[PDB]
Amino acid sequence: PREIITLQLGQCGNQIGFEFWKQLCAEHGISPEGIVEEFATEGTDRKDVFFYQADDEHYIPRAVLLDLEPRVIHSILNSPYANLYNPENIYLSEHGGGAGNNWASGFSQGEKIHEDIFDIIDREADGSDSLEGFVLCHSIAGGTGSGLGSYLLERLNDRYPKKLVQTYSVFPNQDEMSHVVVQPYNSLLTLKRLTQNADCVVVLDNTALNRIATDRLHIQNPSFSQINQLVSTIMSASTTTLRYPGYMNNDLIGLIASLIPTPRLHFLMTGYTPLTTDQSVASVRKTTVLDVMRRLLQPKNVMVSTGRDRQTNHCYIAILNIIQGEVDPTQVHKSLQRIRERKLANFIPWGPASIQVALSRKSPYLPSAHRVSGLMMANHTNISSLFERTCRQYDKLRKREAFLEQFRKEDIFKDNFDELDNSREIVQQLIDEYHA
Amino acid sequence: PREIITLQLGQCGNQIGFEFWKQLCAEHGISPEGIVEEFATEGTDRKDVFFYQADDEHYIPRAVLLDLEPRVIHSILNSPYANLYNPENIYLSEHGGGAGNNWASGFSQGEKIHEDIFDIIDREADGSDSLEGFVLCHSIAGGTGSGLGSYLLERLNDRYPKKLVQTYSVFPNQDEMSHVVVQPYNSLLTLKRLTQNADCVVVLDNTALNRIATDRLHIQNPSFSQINQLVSTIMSASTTTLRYPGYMNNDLIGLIASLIPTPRLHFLMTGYTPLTTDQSVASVRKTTVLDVMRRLLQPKNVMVSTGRDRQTNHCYIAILNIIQGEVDPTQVHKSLQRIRERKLANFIPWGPASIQVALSRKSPYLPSAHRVSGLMMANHTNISSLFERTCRQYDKLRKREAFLEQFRKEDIFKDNFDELDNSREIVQQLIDEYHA
Amino acid sequence: RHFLLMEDGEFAQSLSDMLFEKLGSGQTPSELLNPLVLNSILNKALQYSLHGDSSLASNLTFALKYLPEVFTPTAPDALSCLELKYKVDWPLNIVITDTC
Amino acid sequence: SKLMSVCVMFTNCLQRFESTINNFDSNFSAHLMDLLDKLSMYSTSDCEHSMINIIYRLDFNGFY
């Protein structure tokens, strides 16, 4: 019916998808090894849209996880949520990889394991006779998720041409350049494949993570154990129309169709306010829906590093405001009434704009059926500031003679560096041209 | 709608605005971290006029607090009223400043933090599409509130030209000149900016504070902990037509428009009688409104050091008499009946005068719905006695060779001392000329 | 008292904004959409001040009368030709008559 | 029926694998004029209560 195959790949893409499947059992009322609660069918009306359909009421995840590093998968099998995963769909015990840290490693390893990489991931494709598409849950940081992920964006474009492609890709961190220095090279090589060899992306910045991780979360030493908490909730938040029973844009080709203006303009800004557990003691007094979307357009919950004074000459075109759970829908048109009076979104002068609001009932659970949740999927034309940030860090590195002799020994014979530079400037010029 | 941004600035301006926001929660029936009482909407009909409008029924204050001294803000976060303040609107934890004690320090620090001082205070400006104006809750005493406050009176005059400017500024103390000696220099430099670069002020004398602080309050050692009690009540008293539901002059551009005769004549005399808690046991017998405004024009509650024998050749032009709470309005025209018989206000012989009286219901609280309150906003032409006091202490100091070599090393190359002297005498001559 | 006597002055302050939408008469349209968008913006003005429910908001109606302000054609005013109409309902008819 | 015909006109030129784009633009302006005539038909309804207020909020939502 609407079966999606997630493509978890890389050192960071496997960990953000590990707790994504772990989030799904707590809201479906199911255990990874059994069914102890009856809340799975009376409370939740649809479960076989991301999981594989049941053979013994055991909803297998439709997931594949490949990585060159064996460290990310050795921290999985000792956890009690790995018995839900199957040791025959992806790998058996003692799976390995390369050495290995290179963008050209996984780019060259795709055609030497070409027979095996297109054998076991295609067995899940013909399980349903109407496949939805493929989401590449991969990474941009490092050479593991960026090297091999650029290969599958090409060969799955023609072997599966009638399928939706759209990824939840995480952006790397640009604070210092000591541990990694190959960061401007492997990022722009995958970013070219994300626009012409891929339809849509969902951007997730790393410098904007610790802006939120010290905002309300109150940590002193930033660890990697907090990167999975902001990411796994908004992943399950994006499929609330798709997993839980909704009516309009209840498919993944429903939501993405109403937000993309044009190809190579698909970078969607994400926002999510409620992350604090001591808000729970004051939501008993009928906290309404009239105050939760006034702060979405206000740049506080954003996960995109952008300029603060560059929003006057940029214009919103498509903005999504997803409320979940208890909505009190007699005032949801009242919340959309107050949008035109502020004009917090700059509107495009050539065409109409749209503020789309939708709702779906959440899990039968006490932290879910009590507190209001707001998921934002914006589309603003100030996203070229990240593309100006990455390009200015790209041409400055090529004048310092950095990784021009250390990178072209394997499988690179011609200069494909300006092939990425002009196509990035094509995106940056057509964005500002789009508001005439 | 009618949103005002308060500009709390300086060592004394931050403390008088700290209990100003602390006064507002006790009368709105709200807590700084929660909403435990239902008296906020049934009793008070308007709350989003000084606070930011709610997102979770949490009325954020529309306040900014900058100071060179970190001592005033380190006595804030341990108090339980600081969680209502936000650590992202102004500063995060560990904010600092200069060394620092100079008028030329903050006057030169305004253009080196020029990018950051016009970035986060403008985010609250576009929250409402109809901004009321700006009130500079700053100080004249010291070099901290007087040095940086003179800069924002210039650059906000043209960047926001259609907004009301009016300040509740406190005057410094002129008892001895041992601890501070730079008091005649930094005061007159800001006083020039208060007349031509600012529309209106609200004067608050320091030598008149301890006249009242030993009148009925009965203290032996005058401390700084009493300076916030007379100031925070009359601040909330001035917005009773604006916060609580009134009809006429219910805006800040309503009250100030009916009292200013002309530009550079805007210094308003303030009066406030009821400050004693043992009056409460005899207000149960219907204490009327006929006796509360007979003592307002009588010079007893005034906060302005002026001459007692100089009121015969000076004339009142505009006098405001604000009653609050229980008024018994069938005798409020009876109180205004007795005004013409005494002629306690000398009237201008060239034009008409006006005794404006207004009322608004107070907070649903027992010390507020029982005792009569009278707020005075006078305008008398004997205010040049303070300007004669400051100018005679200004030219006497320049003949003693005091701070002419110690003040012109940084960012002062020409003598701008007589630029302040003639413009002060322009105010003093046009006041006496105004009654022809 | 709140919407005819104006002692909750937020509605009459919002009437000043409706007085800030006329600015002299007549220069206003004479279409039939002229009552259609002008009866609305007074209902929208009550939510602009955040007061009252819709239970008493059915008792307020606005009837845009027609009087010439260029004085040969019509272009009706909102300084003196915009009128609030209070309603007569099912139980309350001994309070409100046609003279009042 | 005019709105359904343009999407029938759309889905055949996407079915193929010149002149079709000006046929789309002429049919685009044709239904734009009819929805503006439909926009006047909502506002000329009865000059009455909230059924004209609901359909007005349809019309401003289609405008921005």
Nearest-angstrom CA–CA distance, B345 and B319: 9
Is B56 close to A294, i.e. CB distance below 8 A? no
Amino acid occupying residue A278:
D
- Please say whether the beta carbons of A147 and A105 come within 8 A: yes
Of C8, C13, C48, nearest to B45 by CB-CB distance is: C8
Nearest-angstrom CA–CA distance, A339 and A294: 8
Check residue A94 and give left, alpha or beta (phi > 0: left; psi -120 to 50: alpha). left
Q: Provide the number of CB pairs (under 8 Å) joining chain C to chain D.
A: 14
Nearest-angstrom CA–CA distance, C52 and B245: 13
At residue C8, the 3 state secondary structure works out as: coil
Give the 3-state secondary structure of chain B.
CCEEEEEEECCCHHHHHHHHHHHHHHHHCCCCCCCCCCHHHHCCCCCCCCECCCCCCCCCECEEEECCCCHHHHCCCCCCCCCCCCCCCCCCCCCCCCCCCCHHHHHHHCCCCHHHHCCCCCCCCCCCCCEEEEECCCECCCCHHHHHHHHHHHHHHHHCCCCEEEEECECCCCCCCCCCCCHHHHHHHHHHHCCCCCCEEECCCCCCHHHHHCCCCCCCCCCHHHCCHHHHHHHHHHCHHHHCCCCCCCCHHHHHHHCCCECCECEEEEEECCCCHHHHHHHHHCCCCCCCCCCCCCCCCECCCCCCCCCCCCCEEEEEEEEECCCCCCCHHHHHHCHHHHCCCCECCCCCCEEEEEEECCCCCCCCCCCCEEEEEEEECCCHHHHHHHHHHHHHHHCCCCCCCCCCCCCCCCCCHHHHHHHHHHHHHHHHHCCC
Give the 3-state secondary structure of A18-63.
HHHHHHHHHHHCCCCCCCCCCHHHHCCCCCCCCECCCCCCCCCECE
Is D56 close to C37, i.e. CB distance below 8 A? yes
Resolution (Å units): 17.0
Is C35 close to D52, i.e. CB distance below 8 A? no
Give the 3-state secondary structure of B42-83.
HCCCCCCCCECCCCCCCCCECEEEECCCCHHHHCCCCCCCCC
Is A353 close to D64, i.e. CB distance below 8 A? yes
Cβ-based contacts of B55 with chain A (< 8 Å): 291-292, 294-295
Is A279 close to B56, i.e. CB distance below 8 A? yes
By CB atoms closer than 10 A (0-12, 13-18, 19+), residue B400 is: exposed
The response to whether A143 counts as a known ligand-binding position is: yes
Q: Is B48 on the interface with C (CB under 8 A)?
A: yes
Minimum Cα–Cα distance from C54: chain D residue? D50
Is A352 close to D64, i.e. CB distance below 8 A? yes
Nearest-angstrom CA–CA distance, B21 and A125: 62
Of B57, B126, B129, nearest to A287 by CB-CB distance is: B57
Site from B45, B129, B162 to mutate, C interface, most C CB atoms within 10 angstroms: B45
Cβ-based contacts of D53 with chain C (< 8 Å): 40, 43
Site from A217, A286, A293, A294 to mutate, B interface, most B CB atoms within 10 angstroms: A294
Q: Which chains touch C (3 or more CB pairs under 8 A)?
A: B, D
Nearest-angstrom CA–CA distance, B20 and B236: 7
Q: Which chains touch B (3 or more CB pairs under 8 A)?
A: A, C
Cβ-based contacts of D43 with chain C (< 8 Å): 32-33, 36
Nearest-angstrom CA–CA distance, B416 and B189: 9
Other beta carbons within 10 angstroms of residue B108's beta carbon come to: 16
By CB atoms closer than 10 A (0-12, 13-18, 19+), residue B23 is: middle
Is A308 close to B123, i.e. CB distance below 8 A? yes
Dihedral through CA A250, CA A256, CA A259, CA A262, nearest 10? -150
Cβ-based contacts of B247 with chain C (< 8 Å): 6-9, 12
Cβ-based contacts of B123 with chain A (< 8 Å): 308
Q: Is C12 on the interface with B (CB under 8 A)?
A: yes
Cβ-based contacts of A340 with chain D (< 8 Å): 60, 64
Nearest-angstrom CA–CA distance, A367 and A280: 8
CB within 8 Å of B22: residues ≥ 6 apart: B32, B81, B232
Q: At what angle do helices C38-49 and C10-19 cross, to 10 degrees?
A: 140
Q: Is C48 on the interface with B (CB under 8 A)?
A: yes
In this complex, whether D and B touch, counting 3 or more CB pairs under 8 angstroms, is no
The response to whether A106 counts as a known ligand-binding position is: no
Of C6, C12, C51, nearest to B45 by CB-CB distance is: C51
Is C9 close to B246, i.e. CB distance below 8 A? yes
Q: Is C31 on the interface with D (CB under 8 A)?
A: no
The response to whether A98 counts as a known ligand-binding position is: no
